[PDB]
Write a protein that binds this DNA or RNA. Structure first.
Ligand code: MG
Ligand code: MG
Lengths: 163, 163
DNA sequence: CAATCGTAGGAGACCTTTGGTCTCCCTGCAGAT
DNA sequence: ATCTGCAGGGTCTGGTTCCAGACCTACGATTG
């Protein structure tokens, strides 16, 4: 009963749920790159692969990863980056033996009753902390919303339910 | 000794050069998927990882990969795709033990004197044929220009010269 | 450090060489033989 | 099948045969 959840973008995270009910969540590793004479943050491929290889989740574990679907009004750099982060994550997960299942944000948001929220990121952190109370301290900052999304993706895949 | 060259886009290829002078080139694996009610070609992650795992090139072999640099006039779908394809290949190569070195198309084109051609893809196929004459039969078609570019990237990395 | 705001954006190599100049794809989808 | 031409484009799910309604992200910058 292992489940993995991945928020693949630059502030994202990977969550790992164990059969005994324990959970781990890891911020996505990144590095600072020079592009067009400015600095950009980019996912750290080797650290991701090393992170996956050190997981105790066995081969065949399912990884639920949020589907890339940027808005037509997002810029072309946004489109490249969501595509790049998605491809790098999917290849790393497959190479590490995990079975990848893409999930639309509409799917897990509806599942946990989070659609049409005035504060979607805050509500995600609140839902994740309720499902994983031992992660409550790791979810108190606004910048922890990627941790929450990864946990909620894993909770969705595991079929967990809010009280 | 061993050198890998990767043209990462959907009609691209991976070339593998051996220390004895032999060469192999494989079209990039792809599948057809439904996106927004139409059919799209997307690289086949699992097939790419299995291909890489089957190479005799040892760990630490350098994989020269063409840097993604879409034009600001290309559509946002082109930007997403080139990012996705790039990320997928980089992670697959890293996970399979290879050292990844991104090369700009202007670098290997200038090295082989191909800059400012009015028929750049035809010229690439001609140059690859001369450098790898046993691949002449595999470079006869217009759609083989991806195979040509992968071979030229690998030949660049190995320091080959046209006669 | 952590949060907020507002728009949606190229990038690279090598020279002219501490800024300038010139170069380079790709995707998606319809058509034609 | 292979190639040519040419413009640069959302995509998804829950509900059916198209509709209705839903969803981000990146990149720079400034505020304490
Ligand atoms: Mg997300
Ligand atoms: Mg290319």
């Amino acid at each position: 009963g292992w489940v993995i959840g991945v928020d693949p973008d630059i502030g994202g995270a990977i969550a790992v749920l164990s059969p005994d009910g324990s959970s781990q969540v890891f911020d996505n590793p990144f590095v600072h790159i020079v592009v067009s004479e400015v600095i950009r943050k980019r996912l750290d491929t080797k650290s991701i692969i090393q992170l996956l290889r050190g997981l105790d989740a066995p081969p065949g574990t399912t990884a639920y990863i949020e589907k890339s679907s940027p808005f037509p009004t997002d810029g072309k750099q946004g489109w490249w980056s969501t595509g790049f982060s998605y491809g790098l994550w999917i290849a790393s997960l497959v190479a590490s033996g995990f079975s990848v299942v893409p999930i639309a944000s509409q799917t897990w948001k509806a599942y946990f009753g989070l659609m049409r929220s005035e504060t979607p990121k805050d509500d995600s952190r609140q839902a994740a902390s309720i499902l994983f109370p031992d992660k409550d301290q790791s979810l108190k900052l606004k910048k922890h919303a990627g941790r929450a999304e990864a946990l909620l993706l894993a909770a969705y895949g595991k079929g967990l339910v809010l009280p």
